Amino acid sequence: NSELDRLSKDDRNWVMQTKDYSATHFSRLTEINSHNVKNLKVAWTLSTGTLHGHEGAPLVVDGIMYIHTPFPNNVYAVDLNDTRKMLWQYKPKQNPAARAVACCDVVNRGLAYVPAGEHGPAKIFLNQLDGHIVALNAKTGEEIWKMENSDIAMGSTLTGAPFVVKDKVLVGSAGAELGVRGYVTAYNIKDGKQEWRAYATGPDEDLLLDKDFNKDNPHYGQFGLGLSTWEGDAWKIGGGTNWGWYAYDPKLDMIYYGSGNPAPWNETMRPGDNKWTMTIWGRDADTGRAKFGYQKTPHDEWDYAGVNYMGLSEQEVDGKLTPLLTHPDRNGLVYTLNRETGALVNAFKIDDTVNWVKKVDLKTGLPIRDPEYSTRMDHNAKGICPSAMGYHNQGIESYDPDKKLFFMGVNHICMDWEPFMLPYRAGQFFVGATLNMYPGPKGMLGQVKAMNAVTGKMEWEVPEKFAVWGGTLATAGDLVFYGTLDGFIKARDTRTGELKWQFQLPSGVIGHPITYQHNGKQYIAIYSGVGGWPGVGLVFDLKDPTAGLGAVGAFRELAHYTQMGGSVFVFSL
Amino acid sequence: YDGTHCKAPGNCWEPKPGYPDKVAGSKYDPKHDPNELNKQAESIKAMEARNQKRVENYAKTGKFVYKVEDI
Numbered sequence: 001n002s003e004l005d006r007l008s009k010d011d012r013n014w015v016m017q018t019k020d021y022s023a024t025h026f027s028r029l030t031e032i033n034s035h036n037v038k039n040l041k042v043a044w045t046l047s048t049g050t051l052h053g054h055e056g057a058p059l060v061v062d063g064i065m066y067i068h069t070p071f072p073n074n075v076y077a078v079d080l081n082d083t084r085k086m087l088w089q090y091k092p093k094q095n096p097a098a099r100a101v102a103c104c105d106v107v108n109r110g111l112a113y114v115p116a117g118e119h120g121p122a123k124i125f126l127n128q129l130d131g132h133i134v135a136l137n138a139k140t141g142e143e144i145w146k147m148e149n150s151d152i153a154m155g156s157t158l159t160g161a162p163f164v165v166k167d168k169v170l171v172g173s174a175g176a177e178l179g180v181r182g183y184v185t186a187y188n189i190k191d192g193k194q195e196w197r198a199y200a201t202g203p204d205e206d207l208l209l210d211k212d213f214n215k216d217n218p219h220y221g222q223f224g225l226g227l228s229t230w231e232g233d234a235w236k237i238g239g240g241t242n243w244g245w246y247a248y249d250p251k252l253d254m255i256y257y258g259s260g261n262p263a264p265w266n267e268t269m270r271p272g273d274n275k276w277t278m279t280i281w282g283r284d285a286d287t288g289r290a291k292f293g294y295q296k297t298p299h300d301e302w303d304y305a306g307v308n309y310m311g312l313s314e315q316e317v318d319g320k321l322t323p324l325l326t327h328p329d330r331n332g333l334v335y336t337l338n339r340e341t342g343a344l345v346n347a348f349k350i351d352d353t354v355n356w357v358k359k360v361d362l363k364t365g366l367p368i369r370d371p372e373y374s375t376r377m378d379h380n381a382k383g384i385c386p387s388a389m390g391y392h393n394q395g396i397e398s399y400d401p402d403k404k405l406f407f408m409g410v411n412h413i414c415m416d417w418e419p420f421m422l423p424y425r426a427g428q429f430f431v432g433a434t435l436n437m438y439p440g441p442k443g444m445l446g447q448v449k450a451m452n453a454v455t456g457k458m459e460w461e462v463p464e465k466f467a468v469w470g471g472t473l474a475t476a477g478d479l480v481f482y483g484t485l486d487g488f489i490k491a492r493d494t495r496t497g498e499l500k501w502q503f504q505l506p507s508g509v510i511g512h513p514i515t516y517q518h519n520g521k522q523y524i525a526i527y528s529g530v531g532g533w534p535g536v537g538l539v540f541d542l543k544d545p546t547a548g549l550g551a552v553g554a555f556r557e558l559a560h561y562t563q564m565g566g567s568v569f570v571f572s573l
Numbered sequence: 574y575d576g577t578h579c580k581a582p583g584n585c586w587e588p589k590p591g592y593p594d595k596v597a598g599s600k601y602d603p604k605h606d607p608n609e610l611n612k613q614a615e616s617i618k619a620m621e622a623r624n625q626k627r628v629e630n631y632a633k634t635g636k637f638v639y640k641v642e643d644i
């Protein structure tokens with residue numbers, strides 16, 4: 001959408017969760033900078049009225065801030081000239097049975113926005129946990145249309161944010177832990193008419209492939225693989241849901257996202273590469289036809305769900321300025337691809353302790369597996385890095401284009417894993433593995449790291465007590481901001497990683513910070529309200545360390561530091 | 574099974590030593606019910622059909638109505 005793209009370049013706005021179509025999460029605002037961030041104070045605050053995990057962040061457009069919640073996914077608008085009053089509210093009526101099919105809390109990664117045009121007035125879009133996509137008037141809150149995307153009776157929910165491109169809103173999927181076969185859907189923003197739907201497994205017509213799919217990298221695989229890398233009909237319940245983030249290059253007219261893990265977690269029940277789960281896609285925006293598809297983790301054994309964000313940049317590769325995507329995967333590798341051809345430029349370990357893979361052969365594009373760290377029936381595999389929670393999860397990260405550095409909150413969590421046989425029954429959990437998780441060999445659960453994605457060179461690395469889950473915001477004031485699971489917001493100098501500021505929020509953070517200028521002054525905002533996968537133990541009062549898909553034991557100390565909460569904090573000088 | 578021995582482009586899967594080339598008939602046979610396997614796809618057809626009704630109604634009347642029984 002060209003007007004959305006233009007609105008994204010104004011520092012008064014934060015028009016999409018990713019900030020802009022390249023997912024830079026980078027602000028040119030410098031009022032707040034490394035030399036005065038120590039003076040940053042709370043300006044004002046709002047309550048969301050709900051508990052549970054608060055993922056994503058507010059949107060800001062045309063002087064209105066929009067806020068969203070976890071289930072039942074209430075939405076509120078706030079005029080920035082009257083921050084105490086709610087301009088409008090929308091309160092969904094959803095079946096509370098939706099909660100029972102969420103694998104890891106009832107998080108919602110947030111709203112999207114389109115400006116007014118021929119389609120009608122400006123709209124806010126909401127994915128509800130119960131599987132509806134809803135279009136709301138951005139200025140009044142009126143419900144304009146509502147369609148059914150996902151069916152909770154099949155274990156199929158929505159958690160990822162909608163994504164606006166041209167006259168379409170993209171809606172993902174969720175429920176691989178319940179054998180949902182993943183699909184992404186484009187809806188026309190005027191009337192909610194389904195325009196195209198692309199599945200992550202199965203026959204080629206369902207995958208929605210360009211006639212020239214992977215023509216530049218035929219060794220990635222081309223046709224028939226959605227069937228031939230499964231045994232029989234196992235692809236029908238095969239996972240590949242896309243609950244994470246997207247990027248878009250308007251010059252190429254291409255949308256980028258990752259498909260999730262194959263189902264069930266029990267690898268021995270689904271022999272084959274299990275294409276096209278765990279795949280970085282480049283799809284034509286108008287038709288949904290894939291031009292490239294690179295499978296990062298063939299025959300997943302670890303739940304390395306391939307849904308993490310896609311950060312676009314232009315950088316020199318062997319002296320030539322090239323359009324790139326960079327993607328820190330759950331599997332602990334940071335991929336950089338040419339975003340026109342799909343060619344692999346680099347794939348390096350985010351932390352050297354990653355051990356399921358020895359390395360990625362960049363010519364063949366294949367990860368060379370270490371059998372000592374495989375999973376398989378009749379075996380309790382120990383000491384696998386990363387755990388299923390990944391060395392990187394749902395946080396949207398940041399890119400300083402002057403430094404050519406990505407700043408990422410990283411997890412340092414390892415696991416044991418033992419599968420078990422189980423039947424598929426629609427609407428029930430279909431996991432099939434028992435996990436225990438614990439810190440990785442360096443001893444702490446999180447890090448923050450700055451790196452060059454082309455060279456793999458780490459500029460700096462700092463430890464964090466807990467996994468850094470919510471992603472980051474970088475600015476031309478030489479700062480990267482992020483929240484922590486133990487309930488701080490923090491700012492570090494992006495040349496060195498030195499800690500410059502921190503503030504104790506009420507609850508742990510699992511979304512990202514935003515910044516915007518309103519009436520000549522720079523503000524930073526963030527959600528506080530812990531939950532999500534790390535917080536499942538405290539959210540649901542679990543004590544078995546293997547519960548919460550293995551998260552409960554790793555995060556058992558988190559409840560000493562944070563309770564649940566739900567607020568929006570806004571800072572300024 | 575190192576992942577590097579490819580039967581065809583994009584197909585490098587091999588059984589791990591001691592495990593079977595195919596699971597049907599093995600002790601790891603998932604034994605899925607074909608009728609269960611088809612339920613998600615039938616649910617998506619029903620949702621697609623309801624959504625199409627809501628779209629047709631909007632085009633007919635100019636007013637959005639969600640509940641298909643009220644159209």
Ligand SMILES: O=C(O)c1cc(C(=O)O)c2c(n1)C(=O)C(=O)c1cc(C(=O)O)[nH]c1-2
Pocket residue numbers: 055103104107158159160173174175176177241242243260261303305388389393394531532533534
């Ligand atoms: O594969 C499934 O579709 C699915 C859904 C979700 C979700 O919808 O939040 C998560 C996951 N998987 C998952 O593997 C995971 O590591 C995870 C973390 C979180 C979270 O927000 O804290 N959600 C999810």
Ligand SMILES: [Ca+2]
Pocket residue numbers: 176177260261303305
């Ligand atoms: Ca998953």
